[PDB]
Amino acid sequence: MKLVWTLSSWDDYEFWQRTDARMVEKINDLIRNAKRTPFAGLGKPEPLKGDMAGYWSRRITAEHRFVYRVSGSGSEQRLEVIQCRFHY
Amino acid sequence: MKLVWTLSSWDDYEFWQRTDARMVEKINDLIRNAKRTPFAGLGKPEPLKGDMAGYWSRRITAEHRFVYRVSGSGQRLEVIQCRFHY
């Protein structure tokens, strides 16, 4: 199970490292949980629609969302983090 | 450029987040530098061989190495390890 960040999602994760470590911890918990149970668990996961269909979202806080997609089958999967800051 | 962790190297990174912020900073700097110059710069990047050909290592500290691969096209920096040595 690989963890994949984009340029922008890693930048915002770094931003949290620089400004609020509590948010970093929440995001790490969301990651841990989504790798285990992609569609259930922490942060009230909900599927996005339209051009973001395959993507899912969980709450970090009311103002900040963790958007991701788990891809791959069986034993070689990946979680792609698309956003970890702001609304969708 | 996308940043890829394995289960093992993310566990390494989390371990540093839990235990030593200086290491997290040093790792973040190596990631940053390797995104702009994958085979040169901070930490004295050297290419590994044989068993681990295609991989590269940079020094985090005396006893900890940052080991990574670059794969891809139009790219990915894959962090394979960032705790311990050999």
Author numbering:
A (entry chain A): 1 to 88
B (entry chain B): 1 to 74, 77 to 88
List sentences from the manuscript:
Type II TA systems are the best understood, and contain both a protein toxin and a more labile protein antitoxin. Many toxins have been identified that degrade RNA, including ribosome-dependent RNase toxins in the RelE family and sub-members YafQ, HigB, and YoeB. Translation inhibition arises from YoeB binding the ribosomal A site and proceeding to cleave mRNA. YoeB toxins conform to a previously characterized RNase fold consisting of two helices packed against a twisted four to five-stranded antiparallel beta sheet.
The structure of the YoeB toxin from A. tumefaciens, herein referred to as AtYoeB, was determined at 1.75 Å resolution. When compared to the EcYoeB toxin, there is an overall RMSD of 0.6 Å for the core residues with 1.2 Å deviation overall. As can be deduced from the protein sequence alignment in Figure 1, these two toxins are 57% identical (76% similar) at the amino acid level, including absolute conservation of the EcYoeB catalytic residues noted in previous studies (blue boxes). The AtYoeB sequence contains four inserted amino acids, located in a loop between beta-strands 4 and 5. This loop was disordered in one of the two copies of AtYoeB present in the crystallographic asymmetric unit; in addition, this loop makes interactions with the tungstate-terillium compound that was critical for bridging important crystal contacts and that was required to obtain usable diffraction quality crystals. The YoeB dimer interface is well conserved among this class of toxin, largely solidified by two tryptophan residues from each monomer (conserved at positions 5 and 10 for both At and EcYoeB) forming an aromatic ring cluster, in addition to polar interactions mediated by conserved Tyr13, Gln17 and Asn18 side chains. Additional interactions are noted for AtYoeB at positions that differ from its Ec counterpart: (Ec to At) Leu14Glu, Glu18Arg, and Lys32Arg. These changes generate additional polar interactions for the AtYoeB dimer. Examination of sequence variants and available structures pointed to a four amino acid helix that varies in sequence and appears to make important contacts with the first base of the mRNA codon in the ribosome.
